[PDB]
Design a protein around this ligand. Sequence first.
Ligand code: CLR
Ligand code: OLC
Ligand code: OLC
Ligand code: OLC
Ligand code: OLC
Ligand code: OLA
Ligand code: OLA
Ligand code: OLA
Ligand code: OLA
Ligand code: OLA
Ligand code: OLA
Ligand code: OLA
Ligand code: OLA
Length: 364
Amino acid sequence: PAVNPWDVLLCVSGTVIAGENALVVALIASTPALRTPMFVLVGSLATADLLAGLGLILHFVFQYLVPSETVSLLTVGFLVASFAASVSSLLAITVDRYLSLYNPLTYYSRRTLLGVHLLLAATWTVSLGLGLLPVLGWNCLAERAACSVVRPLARSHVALLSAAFFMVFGIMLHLYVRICQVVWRHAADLEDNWETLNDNLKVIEKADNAAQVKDALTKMRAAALDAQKATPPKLEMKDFRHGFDILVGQIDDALKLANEGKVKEAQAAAEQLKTTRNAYIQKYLAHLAATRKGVRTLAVVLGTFGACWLPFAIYCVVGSHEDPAVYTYATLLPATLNSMINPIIYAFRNQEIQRALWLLLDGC
Ligand SMILES: CC(C)CCC[C@@H](C)[C@H]1CC[C@H]2[C@@H]3CC=C4C[C@@H](O)CC[C@]4(C)[C@H]3CC[C@]12C
Ligand SMILES: CCCCCCCC/C=C\CCCCCCCC(=O)OC[C@H](O)CO
Ligand SMILES: CCCCCCCC/C=C\CCCCCCCC(=O)OC[C@H](O)CO
Ligand SMILES: CCCCCCCC/C=C\CCCCCCCC(=O)OC[C@H](O)CO
Ligand SMILES: CCCCCCCC/C=C\CCCCCCCC(=O)OC[C@H](O)CO
Ligand SMILES: CCCCCCCC/C=C\CCCCCCCC(=O)O
Ligand SMILES: CCCCCCCC/C=C\CCCCCCCC(=O)O
Ligand SMILES: CCCCCCCC/C=C\CCCCCCCC(=O)O
Ligand SMILES: CCCCCCCC/C=C\CCCCCCCC(=O)O
Ligand SMILES: CCCCCCCC/C=C\CCCCCCCC(=O)O
Ligand SMILES: CCCCCCCC/C=C\CCCCCCCC(=O)O
Ligand SMILES: CCCCCCCC/C=C\CCCCCCCC(=O)O
Ligand SMILES: CCCCCCCC/C=C\CCCCCCCC(=O)O
């Protein structure tokens, strides 16, 4: 028993990672529709995870099948660059999601596409550099007292890697809270205006004087428009939104009658407003149910990223080369599992990626 079980587990993990992310890469590459900034970023993440998966397999190969210290230095440097590129790609994705939420219009501009190009060129340039430094000689091959828990990386180089991870993670947390903030605000405004919409509709049905009817119709018009704004836009869906378009229209019809002195007729028009409102009551509950689920996903995915990488990042600066290798393996394996989760969260859950997959399975 000279093969270490953990090395086999990493090879298995790398195989799953490579297979998952190779499929994502193939789907985006062969689908001209998937060329927006968002998908350029997903393709970068998938490529990095693909490279990291292959790297785990290669590390096994040149440890056990072609024993080579030199090529093992290359494989570890390869993995440093691949995981750096994956973590930095997650940062870039998060930046993009922030910008699309905070700039519902100016996000769709030439600057945004330029920004992804420059950001990815920079993250990949830095990622490669980080893996190239040990290959060029910033390693512990000469001085074994300077070895980190991941051979043959030098403790000082690994400290830099962990510092970069902590900074990247801190930025993601900042963006996460801002994203969370915007999603909560819009959901709160939608639920507010929807409730006031219903309140005034009851005022109409129970009105006893004409002043109440006009007042309630005036508030319904404002609430309808505010509820529309809080709904995310179609693109660059708008069916739930267009439900408010015909509500404003009906409210304007009732207001016209009320202003001409036909308040009885304006009140009776609430039956039609209640009919309209009831038709979109499910789309409203479904939208609130989707945002709720999305918020949960946000936190779960970021928490899982932290649970997978933080123990490793911490142990890499606290541990030393004297520790048994199992503690490096036990903290490294979860970090690799995150590269199995990434394609599911950022690629396979996307409807356009699923469509490309359907066209691929069905022979186009
Ligand atoms: C040690 C490893 C990391 C070296 C990797 C070298 C090559 C293969 C890397 C470096 C930069 C990478 C590119 C950077 C960004 C993108 C955009 C993405 O939408 C598709 C993949 C693509 C086009 C990558 C393809 C692979 C790539 C060219
Ligand atoms: C020996 C171990 C097994 C190695 C062998 C399995 C490797 C699977 C990896 C990636 C497959 C997903 C990427 C390929 C997806 C198809 C590429 C494509 O676009 O094909 C279009 C064509 O119409 C259809 O063949
Ligand atoms: C991250 C930056 C570093 C990335 C580095 C990627 C380098 C890959 C390039 C070429 C393949 C080289 C393959 C070398 C195959 C060597 C086969 C061999 O003979 O090596 C066994 C040797 O004899 C034992 O004694
Ligand atoms: C060895 C090197 C290690 C480096 C370790 C540190 C990593 C973090 C550095 C840069 C990421 C910057 C990402 C962009 C930050 C957010 C930009 C943003 O939100 O602003 C966009 C602006 O508002 C548009 O108008
Ligand atoms: C989302 C999933 C997140 C998963 C996060 C996992 C974090 C694992 C961290 C520590 C486990 C350490 C396990 C160490 C097992 C040691 C067994 C033992 O006794 O070691 C023998 C050794 O020779 C005597 O030093
Ligand atoms: C989806 C792919 C299937 C994954 C199955 C899991 C792969 C398990 C591979 C290696 C695990 C090694 C188990 C360790 C055996 C005991 C080792 C020992 O006692 O020395
Ligand atoms: C044996 C060395 C291990 C490295 C293997 C390298 C093979 C994978 C390299 C790149 C795959 C990424 C291809 C990206 C295609 C995207 C095209 C597009 O976005 O339009
Ligand atoms: C593009 C698919 C992924 C390819 C990289 C991962 C799989 C491993 C591929 C090749 C491993 C063998 C490399 C060549 C070994 C030569 C040994 C020798 O010449 O003595
Ligand atoms: C993408 C950039 C990659 C290179 C970044 C570094 C640039 C500076 C040039 C050379 C320094 C790299 C080598 C440092 C370790 C030397 C160890 C030694 O000589 O024994
Ligand atoms: C802002 C981009 C900067 C690009 C240039 C960066 C150049 C980096 C060069 C060297 C980094 C430090 C390398 C340390 C080598 C130590 C060698 C050893 O310990 O034996
Ligand atoms: C995130 C900051 C922590 C430092 C990151 C280090 C990145 C190294 C990545 C892959 C190298 C994996 C090599 C295989 C583990 C062997 C462990 C051992 O030395 O016994
Ligand atoms: C998740 C919270 C993010 C907070 C980021 C704080 C800034 C992090 C920057 C540097 C800290 C890492 C320095 C590690 C040095 C260890 C050296 C050693 O003992 O080998
Ligand atoms: C048994 C399949 C495991 C599936 C993934 C979960 C990983 C944790 C379970 C087992 C780890 C591999 C076996 C540990 C070998 C102990 C000997 C050693 O430390 O080198």
